[PDB]
Amino acid sequence: RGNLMGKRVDFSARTVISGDPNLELDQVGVPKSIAKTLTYPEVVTPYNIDRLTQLV
Amino acid sequence: KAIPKDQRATTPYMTKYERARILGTRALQISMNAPVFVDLEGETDPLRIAMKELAEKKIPLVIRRYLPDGSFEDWSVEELIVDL
Amino acid sequence: ATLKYICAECSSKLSLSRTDAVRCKDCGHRILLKARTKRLVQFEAR
Amino acid sequence: KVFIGRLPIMLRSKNCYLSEATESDLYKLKECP
Amino acid sequence: EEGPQVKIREASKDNVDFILSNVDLAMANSLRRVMIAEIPTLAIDSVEVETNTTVLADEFIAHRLGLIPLQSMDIEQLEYSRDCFCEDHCDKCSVVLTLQAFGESESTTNVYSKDLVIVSNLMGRNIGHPIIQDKEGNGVLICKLRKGQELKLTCVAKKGIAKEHAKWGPAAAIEFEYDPWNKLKHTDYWYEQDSAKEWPQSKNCEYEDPPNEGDPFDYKAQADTFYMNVESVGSIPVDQVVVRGIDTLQKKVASILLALTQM
Amino acid sequence: MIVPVRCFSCGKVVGDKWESYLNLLQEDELDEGTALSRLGLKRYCCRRMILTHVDLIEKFLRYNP
Amino acid sequence: PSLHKMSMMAHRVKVIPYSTFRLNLSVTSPYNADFDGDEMNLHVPQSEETRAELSQ
Amino acid sequence: NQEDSMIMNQSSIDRGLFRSLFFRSYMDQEKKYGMSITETFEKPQRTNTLRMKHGTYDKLDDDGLIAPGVRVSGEDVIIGKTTPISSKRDASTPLRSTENGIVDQVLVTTNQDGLKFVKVRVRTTKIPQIGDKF
DNA sequence: AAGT
RNA sequence: AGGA
DNA sequence: ACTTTTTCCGG
Lengths: 56, 84, 46, 33, 263, 65, 56, 134
Ligand SMILES: [Mg+2]
Ligand SMILES: [Zn+2]
Ligand SMILES: [Zn+2]
Ligand SMILES: [Zn+2]
What we know:
part of a larger assembly; 8 chains; C: little secondary structure; F: Arc Repressor Mutant, subunit A; 4 helices; DNA-directed RNA polymerase (chain E); metal-binding (chain E); acetylation (chain E); protein dimerization activity (chain E); nucleus (chain E)
């Protein structure tokens, strides 16, 4: 139950929630500190290469 | 055992799950530097590319729809209707 | 100059070393504090 | 006559120093009145 | 005389009561905003603490010091530290105040805004003098010490506006009112039995004409005439909280006009 | 715990007005209502600042070092 | 808790200042969240595939 | 202020509204190991062990303690301690990774045993921010 | 609070 | 020991 | 005669 059906995971973040009437229905406000910690692995491709190096 | 094309009985339409797994699969391949089957008219996101590939039914994938007994119906993303 | 540790109640400066006994001179009380850094701290007025 | 262990004393009790202490005494004892 | 008219009702060291006529509400409000948060003042913004033996913590006192109002008269001839070329501060961009206090007295020793001394060169301009409005000439009470309690620290006051910190607030409360007899129908009075009875009349009712019910609603009517009152904290003098505000706003509009010309 | 300089709501310098308030009460024998108003604190935000102040500092001073 | 398929929904990230996860007010009900100190979780997909699952 | 949220006057927060102090007392002691094999409150470096924290040991003085003025932050070492073996293993107490602030009071005392007893207070102010409950 |  |  | 569940998250 605790290690297989359920699991503690990576690429997960949690904080206090607050309402924003200027956000869209489908968007979630992510604080910089959390965006700066959470990381997506993008593959270097001819489409991204240029942007990707700038972020690197 | 494999059901022949002339004897297929599943939807002529594509499931929500089929479409979501095709776009995921093509996006993963397009992103893994796979050959793209359409003019990327300024396109740079592998999902948007995959969506465009599907739009022109130019995705070389085949859905193997399995039945509870094990028997299955092979349907092409070309033949599957995308009303959704 | 130099006041390593100040006593906690009488506030008399001690300046003792490691192996010079943790106790005050006149009164017992092993309490003893640390006397603020000479490397001075600055704060914004907000 | 003979020593038989140590009893934890409750603050402000008959056996505690603070019971027999004035505002000035307490402040001196670094204890909140 | 010209465009928008002013008629000052009451004046003092701390308060200007006036009436702004032949003006747009948007103009009188943009003016209200500016006086609250866009006029530059000068206040302590860096407190290098040397010795603190007080009952209060270093930063508690720090925050307090910034709230002490400093003379910001000839503030216009002090550069914003950012714009100055020195690493950190100089006489061109900052006023340096020192504060030393000690409980010599067997009684409680009080630490006042008067106990601040300017160590920097003032270049002969009116700035950095702690505002003492106090009757006994003491000014703000920063602290209190017993005996061996010493307070040693150095402070650097800089330009800044209230938009950056409320310490650079040149004005306290700004009283703003219009149409004391709701003749504009800009409000819907909540009541139990009578709107007119239950709601107290404004003092400004005297300076405007009562509605006189036997007349239709003047929809054509616009809001002009704004019964205002500006309060100075001490830094800049009342009149200047107004004048400086008027100017500050003009300068903002001019910057737009100017930045427009760059394109 | 020591008189707040400037009222939280509007900003009127209030750190000076303390001892004077404590005097208009003790020495001048006035009530709190008239004392605040002598000190020229008219808006309730300013009034509450002094009225509701608990000058804890004085108890902390009773401790030795 | 998560007794709903709607207690876990996919959103567009919007990087913003201040430490709270901001969220549109209409999405309040499905999650059952109030802003009285309620906290929330955020999981980040790592594949271009697990992403499609969320978005689609 | 919708759904149990609330709008706070920023102008007020600055004037001192809802600001609070916060203290945290980190504590440690020198442990004696039978044959008088004690631990030591000192500022360690390399010296065979190399099992030390990543935080700047540099805020420490020779007694293995910060002074009561120093602004601490990451996992900066608050108490430097070492234990030898049959040599300087690290036994250093760093500031809670999550935390940051200014050292307030450092107390050097004696344990009932006669061991070096240390308590370190770290102060911080907390200004009313956006997710803050009231 | 139920149920082998 | 405590939050929703 | 005899057993097992009960919402989700600093020391
Ligand atoms: Mg709630
Ligand atoms: Zn002593
Ligand atoms: Zn300069
Ligand atoms: Zn006020």
